[PDB]
């Protein structure tokens, strides 16, 4: 039917860059 | 001491800041703002 060197520990930690990513207008 | 108890339980109430309307403020732009997709420039013909 159906189919299917690193040291300077404090000064160098204070000099880590803050890189904020830019914005594009819409 | 009752007074020391009341102080211990109510001494840390953070302050409240009130800034009126209409006052001048700045916005320090923190990132590069790119306006290249929404504007273009053209020269206005003379006269």
């Amino acid at each position: 039917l159906t189919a299917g060197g690193g040291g300077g520990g404090e000064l160098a930690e204070k000099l880590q860059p803050m890189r904020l990513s830019g914005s594009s207008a819409g | 001491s009752a007074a020391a108890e009341a102080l211990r339980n109510s001494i840390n109430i953070p302050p409240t800041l009130y800034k009126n309307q209409g006052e001048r403020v700045n916005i320090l732009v923190a990132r590069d703002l790119d306006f290249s997709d929404v504007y273009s420039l053209e020269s206005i013909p003379t006269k």
Binding site: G5, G8, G9, E10, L11 | -
Partner: protein, 50 residues
Amino acid sequence: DRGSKVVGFYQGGLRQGQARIFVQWSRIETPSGVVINLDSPGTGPLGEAG
């Protein structure tokens, strides 16, 4: 040569009873462009540490 620029840094601050700070000098640039990393202690005029 004379006039070569040396660059250092310090950190950590003093403790109580201390009157000298440890300085490490890191690099020196000769007036003619020579550069050598000398990570050496900085001392006083008579060699006392810091």
